[PDB]
Amino acid sequence: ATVNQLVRKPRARKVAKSNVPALEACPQKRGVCTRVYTTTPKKPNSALRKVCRVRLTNGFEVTSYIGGEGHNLQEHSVILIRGGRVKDLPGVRYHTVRGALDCSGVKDRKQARSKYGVKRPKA
Amino acid sequence: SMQDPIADMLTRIRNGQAANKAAVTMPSSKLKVAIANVLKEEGFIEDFKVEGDTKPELELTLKYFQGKAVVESIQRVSRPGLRIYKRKDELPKVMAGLGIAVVSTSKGVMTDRAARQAGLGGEIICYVA
């Protein structure tokens, strides 16, 4: 109620702009890919969407988005991940940087091109 | 029991106007008498008397310029247990110099304009809105 309540019994404290799940207190982080899944969609859709399981270096494992026609991927290759939820998958909280580490720069994007590793304004 | 009697003083002036009364009477601190004089001179009450000692009591007559005046909104800010004191640098400007803060200094009860002009600080009692 009064300020006296708050000196006598302190409150909780909200923050924002930090509510997308993320690891090692940093924006990008590397791990070995473990498994590739074609998996069934969330939300009413029909796209059998493509995800990877990744093994990160700090001893945890998370599931991250992949995409683009004809992109290179195998179940032993080192790739970099960046936080970013995908709202059509069974719980993808990260996406994969195609242009990073063991994988090379790919096309089949428009809407984010510094992400997923692409050159030029739309070519 | 009411622990703050100056909030209670102000809640009687506030309900006074809301029930459109011509006088409002109450129990009277030394502090109360002393506050009522600032409010009288800056014209937030019209006038008052204090009488008895075996029952000491304040009677004041209300503000009007519209029929239901800015006396419906006067609030204590430095209360029991929420004591807050301001220096000669930190004094309260209320309502772009239309409104008043009433400040009890070591040199007596006056508005913030006269406490600033003296260069005193003290306990910051109530703001108008």
């Binding site: - | 309502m95 508005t111 809105a129």
Partner: protein
């Protein structure tokens, strides 16, 4: 058929648009509803919700209702003389005194509502519901908690308001 208030200046702030459905009983008709704000340059309580068949007839209806049962209200200088927190129906908005050195600072349709209201330099954060239909009450409730200048000395400032009717 009513008296109306005017400003010598044009405001055509369309804030929202909607459609009316009964879905089986006569099925669904093409009608729209609309909300439009008519200020003055210094402010009005002018807010109008009206409805018709098409969008143009609908807005012009709503623009009419923003200037009947309403009067203009006025405030000197591009700031407000009170730090008060205006609330109207869960849409709560804030003000604190400021300079002329800042003008507007706001986005969407809100920067256009505040300019006619005279409370654009004092513009501080809004909280609660801040979707278009209720955010726009700045120039209504924020001009009913109003203070405005009329004194020559700060120590005559409460005395000068008393003698305005005594």
């Amino acid at each position: 058929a009513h008296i109306e208030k005017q400003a010598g200046e044009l405001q055509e702030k369309l804030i929202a648009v909607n459609r009316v459905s009964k879905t089986v009983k006569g099925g669904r008709i093409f009608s729209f509803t609309a909300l439009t704000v008519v200020g003055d340059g210094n402010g009005r309580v002018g807010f109008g919700y009206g409805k018709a068949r098409e969008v143009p007839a609908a807005i012009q209806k709503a623009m009419e209702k923003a200037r009947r049962n309403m009067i203009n209200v006025a405030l000197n200088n591009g700031t407000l003389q009170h730090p008060v927190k205006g609330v109207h129906t869960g849409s709560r908005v804030f003000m604190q005194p400021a300079s002329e050195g800042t003008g507007i600072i706001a986005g969407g349709a809100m920067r256009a509502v505040l300019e006619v209201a005279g409370v654009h330099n004092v513009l501080a954060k809004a909280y609660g519901s801040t979707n278009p239909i209720n955010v726009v009450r700045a120039t209504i409730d924020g001009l009913e908690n109003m203070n405005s200048p009329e004194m020559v000395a700060a120590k005559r400032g409460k005395s000068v308001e008393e003698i305005l009717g005594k």
